[PDB]
Amino acid sequence: EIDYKDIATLKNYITESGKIVPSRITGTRAKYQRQLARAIKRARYLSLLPYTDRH
Amino acid sequence: MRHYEIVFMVHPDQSEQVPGMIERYTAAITGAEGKIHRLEDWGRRQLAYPINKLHKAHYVLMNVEAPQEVIDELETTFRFNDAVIRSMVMRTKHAVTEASPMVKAK
Amino acid sequence: AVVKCKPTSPGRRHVVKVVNPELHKGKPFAPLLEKNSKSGGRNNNGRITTRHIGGGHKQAYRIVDFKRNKDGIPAVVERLEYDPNRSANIALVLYKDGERRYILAPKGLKAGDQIQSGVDAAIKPGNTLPMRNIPVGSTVHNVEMKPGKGGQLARSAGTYVQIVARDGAYVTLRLRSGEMRKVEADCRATLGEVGNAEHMLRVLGKAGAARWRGVRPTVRGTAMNPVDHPHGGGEGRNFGKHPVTPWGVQTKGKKTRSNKRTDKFIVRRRS
Amino acid sequence: SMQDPIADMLTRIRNGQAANKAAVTMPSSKLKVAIANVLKEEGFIEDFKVEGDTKPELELTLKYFQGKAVVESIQRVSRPGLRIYKRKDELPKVMAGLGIAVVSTSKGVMTDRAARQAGLGGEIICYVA
Amino acid sequence: SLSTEATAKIVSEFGRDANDTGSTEVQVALLTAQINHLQGHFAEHKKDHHSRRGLLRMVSQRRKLLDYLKRKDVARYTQLIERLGLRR
Amino acid sequence: PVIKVRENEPFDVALRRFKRSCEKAGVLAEVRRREFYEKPTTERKRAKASAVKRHA
RNA sequence: CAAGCUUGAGUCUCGUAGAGGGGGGUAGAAUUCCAGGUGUAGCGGUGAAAUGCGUAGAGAUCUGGAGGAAUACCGGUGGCGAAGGCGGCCCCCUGGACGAAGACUGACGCUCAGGUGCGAAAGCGUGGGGAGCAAACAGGAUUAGAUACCCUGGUAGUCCACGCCGUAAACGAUGUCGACUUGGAGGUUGUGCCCUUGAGGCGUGGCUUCCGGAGCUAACGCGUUAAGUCGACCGCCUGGGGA
RNA sequence: GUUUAUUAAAAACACAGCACUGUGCAAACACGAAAGUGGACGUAUACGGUGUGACGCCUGCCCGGUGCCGGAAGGUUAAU
């Protein structure tokens, strides 16, 4: 279900500064945190999410 | 015959040419016995960071059963074509005939 | 493939030859051959102007096409031939209108391969097209300098110019020496490296093998008497000069380019 | 893998006897049942049953006295590594009387004592105490 | 690997039916097919060691099955190595 | 770790928010860390040492 | 020796997770250098200094360019791999593991001297590459001395291709396979039943972390993933130095 | 292999290989007051110069002196 196009949802699981957030904090199951981080890492390629907050 | 999913994005001054590119590529897939399970066109959207100096560019989704033979003609044309700045082909384990979250939200 | 020949005589011990099975066996294509008679390094005054050249084996001249000026018409590679005038191997090509020509064989090019010139042509090795129509990044060879003159840069075995920049009428080339250089961008260049890149790995193994390539012995200045060379005399083995050419100019260090008209095109001299 | 299944039965007793189990099961065989019988006639175990047609299951019922085991100790003797046969004069006796060897003779499995009366020897399977 | 299309083809030939998937002749045949497909992978990819460990398991497993198949019945054994091309 | 001062705010609240935005990012943790090369054997050891300790 | 059987061992069907391996592309951050613009007297470095760079304009700052290497966050007594090991994203080729229900072969098994393969780092060979780091080497400090620790530089090397080398505290200092023997807390990955009514209630596989019982052990400890109770095969030890 | 035809055949010269350095093509360099020619109908895996001399193991310290290379602020300096 979790999906690199869905940049609404992916914003809950990054910072102000566009760092991926750890499962520790968010409470998320670790299967899905793998899928999340992979989603986010594609999103950043396509320029839908940012790497940083310099721009 | 495997399923793929092809986001590319396009130099915004050649938003002119976009439907002309689509109709070549979409034809050339069905030319070799393919499908096209959907196609969207999210239009001009703001980039999260500059690429080639460009703020803004013209995105295009496309989901596609095809062979590997046609997908390389498609990957090569993207590389040689200057108007297309950035490009992705993922693989996928089913088809996806649907709208995305990008079209639905509006 | 390189081949360490087994040491049955003392002159075979160190030989390493560059066998290519893919080359043609049998006589080369007749219309494209010329007479090409040797000079022994001597000029129209009979004087040796270039030392150490002389003798060797007879050689016909293969008329290669460095211009590649026959446009839009596809061409198939018939075979790869040996060429004695040249580190590169060459390829006989048959055009769709029944013309034949020789061309330099790029790396990765065998029988059956279509290759095409001019502006339409696809960006794949073998194919020649003006450097406006090539992607920056690309790796090319047999590059012109003035438009229409013919290929001059990157013709030896295993060589490639590499295109680093566009800027208007001109483009910039990292040449193989390490020398960045502007060339105006209507100039053609074939794509690929040049073939036969194992050519450097060969070892001649004996004196005579050098003589077969037309290359006479070389006598050290320090052997000679003072009248013959600056390095001259000595009882025993002396030196005590600074190294110099036979005509007394410093070697080891001293730069010898004075050519002011070509300076503007040189972005950066070699490393 | 599973290369001496008699030793397996003997271990399953010993380990159940240590863990204070009322009963233990294993895969059956003919020879296990033969031994199981000798062990019962001599009073180290209460009773055995066999259930199943296709994959039969020997269930021994173990025996205790003063809240404490009856089978004080139980060695294998003849292994697959090292088969141990004995002539009738050379038969061992175990705690100088008080335990029992178990011998396969040509007239079936029996005690050490009952092979001396019958006047036989053979493969010595196991001591018990 | 093989596909299912290619697999079913092999059970067909060497078996009795499509539900005799695990007879000794079929197992050998599947392995032999599976080995020869891989000979192309390892032509191109010589430094792939971790996959070749897998290949060598097929080879050894085949050779165990054929040694069984001699102790059972040499009619089936001699038929099978001709049909498949083994032993050389 | 970017911040502005919006209007009718003190200076001293913005300088506080700067620091609670930077300790939230771990800029300085992520810079102490790359002062010196740590061999991977040492990285794994310190990781273990923390995990075993934090059983308390 | 002959004929069987299906529980050990395998084959097929369908799914799930995974830094498993090989090849090919590609992204962004940062260091270095190169060419510019603004700008002026310091910078850098340390315990403190000096060597070093700087009025020939450094450091700081902005723009553009080159190139190489490594992949922040995620990331976890998390995972995969026989071991060595494996970490951005995408594609192509490919190995294994596990689970569910059924079908199939019918002991086809376990272990393995000699043999063959795999095997970190350093190192060697041929050819490329070379940003950063950095054995050797140089200068500066410190010191009784300082052939070192610290500082400024810096070459092999580190990187790629194809060959060799065959070793490590290559360690869980615990050979492989199988069986049995009280518990508790977790993690990870499957799967089946349940006003799914909740991120849940009841079970059932696989891998894994920490406690600890009987027992074992010289003791420390190990403790169902044994160093407990057994069996099969292999490797190895027999005082310290010499070695 | 070569060498002092006519007192020296050698440990001398050459050599395959190694290294440094120059040279971007109207190449460096050489012969020519010049035109021009060789280099080469080659193009940096190519060409010229210098030293060493198969192969194996190696190839340490010194940039004060003399050359060469780079640097431009300042000094000194010609014709004009």
UniProtKB/Swiss-Prot annotation, chain C:
Keywords: Acetylation, Ribonucleoprotein, Ribosomal protein, RNA-binding, rRNA-binding. GO terms for molecular function: RNA binding; rRNA binding; structural constituent of ribosome; transferase activity; zinc ion binding. GO terms for cellular component: cytoplasm; cytosol; cytosolic large ribosomal subunit; DnaA-L2 complex. Changing H229Q: Loss of peptidyltransferase activity in reconstituted ribosomes. No change in rRNA binding or assembly into ribosomes. Signal peptide: none annotated. The modification N6-acetyllysine is found at K241. Part of the 50S ribosomal subunit. Forms a bridge to the 30S subunit in the 70S ribosome, contacting the 16S rRNA. Interacts weakly with S6 in one of the 3.5 A resolved structures. In pull-down experiments interacts with CedA. This protein can be partially replaced in vivo by its H.marismortui (HmaL2) or human (L8, from the 60S cytoplasmic ribosome) homolog. Belongs to the universal ribosomal protein uL2 family. This is Large ribosomal subunit protein uL2. It comes from Escherichia coli (strain K12). The gene is rplB.
Curated annotation (Swiss-Prot), chain D:
GO terms for cellular component: cytoplasm; cytosol; cytosolic small ribosomal subunit. GO terms for biological process: cytoplasmic translation; regulation of mRNA stability; regulation of translation; ribosomal small subunit assembly. Keywords: Repressor, Ribonucleoprotein, Ribosomal protein, RNA-binding, rRNA-binding, Translation regulation. It holds the Pfam family Ribosomal_S8. One of its GO terms (molecular function) is rRNA binding. Disulfide bonds: none annotated. Belongs to the universal ribosomal protein uS8 family. Part of the 30S ribosomal subunit. Contacts proteins S5 and S12. One of the primary rRNA binding proteins, it binds directly to 16S rRNA central domain where it helps coordinate assembly of the platform of the 30S subunit. This is Small ribosomal subunit protein uS8. It comes from Escherichia coli (strain K12). The lineage of its organism: Bacteria, Pseudomonadati, Pseudomonadota, Gammaproteobacteria, Enterobacterales.
UniProtKB/Swiss-Prot annotation, chain E:
It comes from the Bacteria. Keywords: Ribonucleoprotein, Ribosomal protein, RNA-binding, rRNA-binding, Translation regulation. GO terms for molecular function: rRNA binding; small ribosomal subunit rRNA binding; structural constituent of ribosome. The keyword rRNA-binding applies. SUPFAM superfamilies: S15/NS1 RNA-binding domain (SSF47060). One of its GO terms (biological process) is translation. The keyword Ribonucleoprotein applies. It holds the Pfam family Ribosomal_S15. Belongs to the universal ribosomal protein uS15 family. This is Small ribosomal subunit protein uS15.
UniProtKB/Swiss-Prot annotation, chain F:
GO terms for biological process: cytoplasmic translation; ribosomal small subunit assembly. Residues 45-56 have a biased composition (Basic residues). The keyword Nucleotide-binding does not apply. Keywords: Ribonucleoprotein, Ribosomal protein, RNA-binding, rRNA-binding. The keyword tRNA-binding does not apply. GO terms for molecular function: rRNA binding; structural constituent of ribosome. Belongs to the bacterial ribosomal protein bS21 family. Probbly involved in recognition of ribosome rescue factor SmrB in stalled/collided disomes; fusion of protein fragments to its N-terminus decreases ribosome rescue in the presence of SmrB. This is Small ribosomal subunit protein bS21. It comes from Escherichia coli (strain K12). The lineage of its organism: Bacteria, Pseudomonadati, Pseudomonadota, Gammaproteobacteria, Enterobacterales. The chain holds residues 2 to 57 of 71 of the full protein.
